Amino acid sequence: GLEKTVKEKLSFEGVGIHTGEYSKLIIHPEKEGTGIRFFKNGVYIPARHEFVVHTNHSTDLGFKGQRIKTVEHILSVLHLLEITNVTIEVIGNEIPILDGSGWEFYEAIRKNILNQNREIDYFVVEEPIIVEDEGRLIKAEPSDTLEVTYEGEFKNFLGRQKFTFVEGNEEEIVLARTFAFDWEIEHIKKVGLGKGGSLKNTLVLGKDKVYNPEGLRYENEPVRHKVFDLIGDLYLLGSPVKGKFYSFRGGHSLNVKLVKELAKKQ
Ligand SMILES: CCCCCCCCCCCCCCCC(=O)O
Ligand SMILES: CCCCCCCCCCCCCC(=O)O
Ligand SMILES: [Cl-]
Numbered sequence: 001g002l003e004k005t006v007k008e009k010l011s012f013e014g015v016g017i018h019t020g021e022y023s024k025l026i027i028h029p030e031k032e033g034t035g036i037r038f039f040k041n042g043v044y045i046p047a048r049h050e051f052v053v054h055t056n057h058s059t060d061l062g063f064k065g066q067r068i069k070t071v072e073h074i075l076s077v078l079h080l081l082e083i084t085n086v087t088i089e090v091i092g093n094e095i096p097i098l099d100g101s102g103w104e105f106y107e108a109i110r111k112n113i114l115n116q117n118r119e120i121d122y123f124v125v126e127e128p129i130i131v132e133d134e135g136r137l138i139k140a141e142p143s144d145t146l147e148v149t150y151e152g153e154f155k156n157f158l159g160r161q162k163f164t165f166v167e168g169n170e171e172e173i174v175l176a177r178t179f180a181f182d183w184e185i186e187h188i189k190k191v192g193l194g195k196g197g198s199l200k201n202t203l204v205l206g207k208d209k210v211y212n213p214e215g216l217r218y219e220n221e222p223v224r225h226k227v228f229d230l231i232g233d234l235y236l237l238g239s240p241v242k243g244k245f246y247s248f249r250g251g252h253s254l255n256v257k258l259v260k261e262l263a264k265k266q
């Protein structure tokens, strides 16, 4: 595939799920070889693993005193559409959560793609690798196409379920929303996070119920979202990725761990 950017600048605004503050981003086109980078208060923050500063409840990046929380959804959409050269100006300290999925990002960007004059140099997983953390595990192996499987084991009605993404099925995960278990909301609030969360941007699940009146978009929306999250974190490798991944109860922390190990080996 050819490197790509946007035909014209695109903007999105709303509240940050964690800061609860107003935030906006403006995606500006860039020439070939530029890569993906954020811009905040005068500083450019490359969308790469070296700049990750936090991974609990979101993937946050930072450089020279400037931080941007929750980049996983916008990066996932960019990765899925193979947008390789753009500057994402950010107003605020976090990417707007919108409806909790990548839908708005996806539909807007997909309609404004601009192919460029340069072949994409994909990050190709060369050899099998596995990272673990108290039961949680992620395995990556060679593959000509990006394939991502997530298997969860939930302590509620969801039980054990899995979902596999394969190239071409982007629409099957870009609508999956951010979720959250009622028994964990106090903690999230207590650690200074989740200030902008609401039934409008997050699926709240109980031991045996779904609080949102709209219910789940798919019986397995949570695992679909996890796949969506992992795909965004994988883009932190600096280039579109080709490989087969299997995540069992993985989260941002483990996702970034895998990314750093892959980058290290290669
Ligand atoms: C670990 C990942 C997730 C990010 C989740 C942040 C969102 C915080 C939750 C806010 C929802 C509050 C809803 C009130 C509780 C209720 O109705 O039972
Ligand atoms: C179903 C749409 C209704 C809006 C969703 C209701 C959830 C909002 C409650 C959290 C907002 C309060 C933030 C705070 O804790 O100060
Ligand atoms: Cl925490």
Ligand SMILES: [Zn+2]
Residues within 6 Å of the ligand: 056, 057, 187, 188, 191
């Ligand atoms: Zn926590």
Ligand SMILES: [Zn+2]
Residues within 6 Å of the ligand: 072, 073, 178, 225, 229
């Ligand atoms: Zn997410």
